[PDB]
Amino acid sequence: PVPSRARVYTDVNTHRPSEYWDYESHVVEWGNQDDYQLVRKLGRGKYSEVFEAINITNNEKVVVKILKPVKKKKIKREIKILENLRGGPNIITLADIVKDPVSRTPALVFEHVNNTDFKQLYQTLTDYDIRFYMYEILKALDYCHSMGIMHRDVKPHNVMIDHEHRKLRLIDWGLAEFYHPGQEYNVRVASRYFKGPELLVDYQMYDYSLDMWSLGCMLASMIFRKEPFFHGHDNYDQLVRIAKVLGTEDLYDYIDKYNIELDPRFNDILGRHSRKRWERFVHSENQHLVSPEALDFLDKLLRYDHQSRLTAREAMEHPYFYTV
C-alpha cells in the first residue's frame, strides 16, 4: 500500500519528548479507593462497569469506571492520554485512579456528567442545538488532534451531554492512540457503524481524519433522523452500506490511489452502486434539521479519501456554524 500522513498536526509527537507519548514507561500512582463510596450502577460497556459515587472527603459526586481484565498496556495508554488531555475543552476530566485494595482491580474516577438520554435528545433538539453541539465536539477533536491524539471511538454513546446546562463531554478514551507519521495502526478500532472506509479496507496508515468520518456519521444520523446512518450487519457489510450512498466508482478510485488490496470476501457482496445525492435523505420528519449548509458540511466529512475530509479546524470555519 501507498504511504499517507495527516494534513494537520503531522509532527506534534515527533517534536515532543518520549515522556509525552511513551505510555508504557508512564508511572501511574494509584489513589486509595476508601475516599469513594459507590452509590449505583450508571452504565456497563464492553470493558467496564460504571458507577455513580461520592468522594467522601469533599462530598463531590463522581463516576467510577471499574475496568474489566484487559492488557495492562491498554490501561496505561488510556490513563496517559487522559492525563495529557486533562483540562482540554469538552474533554472528560480524570479526577483520580484507584485500585480496590482486596481485589486489586483498577478503576478510573471521573467528573460526573448528568447525561441526557439519546432517544430523548433525538426528538427535542432544534437545528441550532445540533449546530452548537457539533461545534462543542469539534472543539474537543481539534484539541486532542492538536495534542497528537486520535480518539478512534467517536460515537453518540461516547459523547455525554447535559442539555439543561448545555455541557458536552467527549468520553471513553480506551481506544485512543498517539499519532506518529508513517505508523501502521490496528484497524480493529471504533464501533462498526462509525468505522472509516480506511479501517474496513484494512488500510493501516490512518490518522486524525478517522475521527472526522465518525463525526460525519453522527451528523448524518441527527439531521436525517436515521440512526445509525450506515447500518452494517458485519464489518464487510459495513463497507457495502457506505458504497450504497457514496457509490462504488469513488471506492475503486480510493483503493487505486493508495494501492489497497481489497479482501476477497468483498467479491460477492460489494456490487455496483451509483453515488446518491444527499437531498434524497430529506423527508417531512427531518426537513426542519436539514439546510444547504448542513448538506454541504456533511458532503465534506463523508469522503472515502481520508486526506480529502475536512480537518476539525476547517470544519469549525464552515458556513454551517456561523449562527454559533
Next chain:
Amino acid sequence: GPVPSRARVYTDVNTHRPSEYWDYESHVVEWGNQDDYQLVRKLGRGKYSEVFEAINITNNEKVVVKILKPVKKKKIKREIKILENLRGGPNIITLADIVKDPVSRTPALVFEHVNNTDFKQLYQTLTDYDIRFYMYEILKALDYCHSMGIMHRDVKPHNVMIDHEHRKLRLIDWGLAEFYHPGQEYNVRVASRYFKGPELLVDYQMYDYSLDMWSLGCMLASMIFRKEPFFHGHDNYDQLVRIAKVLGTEDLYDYIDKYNIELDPRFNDILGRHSRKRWERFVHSENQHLVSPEALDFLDKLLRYDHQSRLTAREAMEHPYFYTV
C-alpha cells in the same frame, strides 16, 4: 499497667477490610521464573539481604533482585503481602516478581531498579528547595501506606532511594513493615537505633503510624542541620538520653506519666536532667542556607515525645514549609 493508645488517623482501616487483605500468613505466594533474570552486580547488603542489579532477559530492562537471608518464613510472607497491597502507590517501590533459586530454594524479591544517587555526594549539593521537594515525596508515600493500614517501621535515608537527575524518589525495604490493628501490642525491636521513636525506647508497645513521623523528623533534622545522625545514641538506652539532651527531661516525664509507662531501671543513672533546647541552637554557618522559620516550626511538630501530638503525614503536607512545592 500502661494506658491504651490508638492512631488519630486511619485507625480502623484494617478492621473494616476482609482477612484476605491483612492475613499474610494465609496469603498464597506464586514463585516466578528465576531464569528470566541475569545478575549484573552487587548493589547493597543489609541486615536481611544481598541486593543485586539484574537484567530481565525477556525485555532487556534493568531490575533489582533482593536475595533474602535465612529468616522466619512468616516475615517473608508479610513483606510480600505488604508490597502487593501497596503496589502502584505514590513513591512506593514496585515489586515486579517473586522468584526462587531452583537448587538452594532461596527466595528473592524482584523490584523496579532505581539509579540511587550517592548520599555523601547528595549531602552537599541539595538546596533548601530540594529538601522540601524530597520530604514532600516521602510524605506522599507515608500518607499512602498509612491510609492502606501499614506502618513502615524502618524509615531512614538508606531505605529512601533517590534518582536525583530524574527527581525520582522510592521508599524501599518493607521487611519490618506491619499492618496496624488498633490496640495491638507490637515488638519495640524495630527500626534502626538513630530513627527509633521514644515509644520504642521506653518499651511502649501500643504504637502506630506516628512512629514513621518521628523517623521522618530525624531525617529532616539531619539534613537541615547537616548532622548525621541527628540523635547519635551508642545503644538503645543512650538513644533516649540523646533525645532528652535536645527535647529535655520535663516533657519526657510528662509523656511517660500520660501513658503510665514504667521506665526501665537502666535509665536511672544515665538519663539525668536536661533543659529543652531551642531548635535555633543547631543553626551554624555551614547549614544556615537550609534552615528557615518554617523548617524549624515543621521539625518541632514531628519531633515530639507524645506520638499522638505529632503531625500525621496528611497534616505535614499542609504545613507552610511545603508552599513552594
